[PDB]
Design a protein around this ligand. Structure first.
Ligand code: RB5
Ligand code: RB5
Lengths: 148, 148
């Protein structure tokens, strides 16, 4: 499965580390930048990732900034995107099992590298559980439809 | 200022504790439910708080579920809303300083009571820094306008 990855300059080093981790594990990775330490705007990169997931060019995405917060708020503006800011593996698992998140958000300034790899590992392996969780995900879809 | 709060059954007990904390400090609190431990759907209560913040009936909102994830994703579907899921005081502070978050999201199954009160304290007292952070909040606005 193809993973889209993106960051601002606040998530760029952790992005390089996760790109490396993902390839070693045999995922195909599309990197939407940013491509250096220059100051950039997290919404641009959140959008590239979220649009790639929306359009099926990626199956899922990972977005990284200092805290994860800005880039995932932005990613969540896109209809059909469910971006989950996770700071431990329990949140990562539930974001798959309950919320069927198709974007994982991370904060390079909040979680250390090995904690972030545990989180990414957990999230890639967890599976949506349907049932009442599909019903609730539909109700997120109803919000999107209301403001569309 | 007036604070809207809401939860699903997974966030109901933390909600009661936070309401009590906020009153004690002299905030006006509008509780949007849920009002018991019955199984409910986090988007309904996310929407209620998010629409109250948007309509200016509350100044800011606090939304609570098991992880904070579902309710914050749903709250983020409403234009003009910026819901931040925080698991520590640092994230809470940055979410105000950088992202100008007007909803705090919490997970009752992730953060213990006194940590959650530390996060709420930090979040209520932090202030938006403007500047380049305003520019980036406008680019979040551009995404909402694109899918509007
Ligand atoms: O929420 C966005 C991120 O924290 C950004 O990396 C910081 O603003 C870096 O200045
Ligand atoms: O993201 C929403 C929360 O995890 C909910 O409280 C749980 O699904 C409770 O079943």
């Amino acid at each position: 499965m193809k993973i889209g990855i993106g960051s601002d300059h606040g998530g760029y080093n952790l992005k390089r580390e996760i790109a490396d981790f993902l390839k070693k594990r045999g995922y195909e990775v599309i990197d939407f930048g940013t491509h250096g330490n220059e100051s950039v705007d997290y919404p641009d990169f959140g959008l590239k990732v979220a649009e790639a997931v929306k359009s099926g060019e990626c199956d899922r995405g990972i977005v990284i900034c200092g805290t994860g917060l800005g880039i995932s708020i932005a990613a969540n503006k896109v209809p059909g995107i469910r971006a989950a800011v996770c700071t431990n593996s329990y949140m990562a698992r539930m974001s798959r099992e309950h919320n069927d998140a198709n974007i994982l958000a991370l904060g390079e300034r909040v979680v250390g590298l090995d904690l972030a790899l545990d989180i990414v590992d957990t999230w890639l392996k967890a599976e949506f559980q349907g049932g009442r969780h599909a019903t609730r995900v539909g109700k997120i879809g109803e919000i999107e439809k209301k403001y569309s």
